[PDB]
Amino acid sequence: LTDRQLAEEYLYRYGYTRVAEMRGESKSLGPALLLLQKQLSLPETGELDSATLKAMRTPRCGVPDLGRQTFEGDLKWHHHNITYWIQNYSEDLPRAVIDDAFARAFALWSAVTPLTFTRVYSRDADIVIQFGVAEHGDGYPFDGKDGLLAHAFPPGPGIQGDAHFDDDELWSLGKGQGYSLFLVAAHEFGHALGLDHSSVPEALMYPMYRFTEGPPLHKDDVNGIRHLYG
Ligand SMILES: O=C(c1cc2ccc(C3CC3)cc2[nH]1)N1CCCc2cnccc2C1
Ligand SMILES: [Ca+2]
Ligand SMILES: [Ca+2]
Ligand SMILES: [Ca+2]
Ligand SMILES: [Zn+2]
Ligand SMILES: [Zn+2]
Structure with a gap:
């Protein structure tokens, strides 16, 4: 995977591209990058910079960051x-x-x-x-x-x-x-x-x-x- 391919795949899998689509801004990498930099507390440059690439190469949780599927109920336990x-x-x-x-x-x-x-x-x-x-x-x-x-x-x-x-x-x-x-x-x-x-x-x-x-x-x-x- 190239750096650019990893970036596109990371943005997609963790829900950044979908939110950029909802904001009319998925034609170019920049807007989704700003969403990710905000979500991960990186400097908010909108660029595929060294801090952002380092973040994207870092081993992590498979759960998305923006969004989820639809699940049943209010997503908390109701017994002790x-x-x-x-x-x-x-x-x-x-x-x-x-x-x-x-x-x-x-x-x-x-x-x-x-x-x-x-x-x-x-x-x-x-x-x-x-x-x-x-x-x-x-x-x-x-x-x-x-x-x-x-x-x-x-x-x-x-x-x-x-x-x-x-x-x-x-x-x-x-x-x-x-x-x-x-x-x-x-x-x-x-x-x-x-x-x-x-x-x-x-x-x-x-x-x-x-x-x-x-x-x-x-x-x-x-x-x-x-x-x-x-
Ligand atoms: O969407 C999930 C998922 C996990 C999860 C954890 C906590 C919570 C909030 C805390 C109540 C919501 C969640 N949704 N999935 C389960 C995680 C796996 C996954 C991966 N990629 C896309 C979609 C999914 C489906
Ligand atoms: Ca093993
Ligand atoms: Ca793995
Ligand atoms: Ca269960
Ligand atoms: Zn997690
Ligand atoms: Zn599983």
Whole structure:
């Protein structure tokens, strides 16, 4: 992919081109670029500059930034005890390490929400967790190694609330090689609770993958959850 081709594909996939179409301005790259620079808190130049190309090459969440599909209901949970089922496993980590990475991701949200997170072994879990490559049965295919790492669905029935992790990625704890399953799952679980992307670079719900050894929640994430659950 050229830089220009990557830019066009990034703008399309994350919903920038569609919003530029709604504003009569999808004939040239500039307007969609300004939308993206605003959404990602980059300098608002309207140019495919070094900061914008660096942003677009950065591994990130598969969930769109402007918009979503249409889903059922008001996109928040209406019960306190959120259940999750680990449907399958990456071979990249031991099963106990994967289970713990998901438990820890949920423990992060549990402290700042009136919700509890309980593991089940059942199809009826609120949050079904699945590892998948390319087309993995929801019509929202992954893209092979790097680029988008995962996605998740807002609260509701069936696929809603589920979290999928791209197993063309190497899953680790983010040290040496591979992406931290803990940090990606913490981000995806935010979506599964009803949160959208943050435009604050340091927030967990910022769409780009950023490795840290520090506590990953920011004021913006805690406040996001507060504006959802009473
Ligand atoms: O559109 C979504 C999608 C995720 C999501 C997360 C949170 C929320 C708000 C917080 C309540 C809405 C969401 N929509 N899809 C699920 C994510 C995958 C995807 C990828 N590209 C285009 C469309 C879709 C469909
Ligand atoms: Ca579900
Ligand atoms: Ca990928
Ligand atoms: Ca893998
Ligand atoms: Zn995301
Ligand atoms: Zn999926």
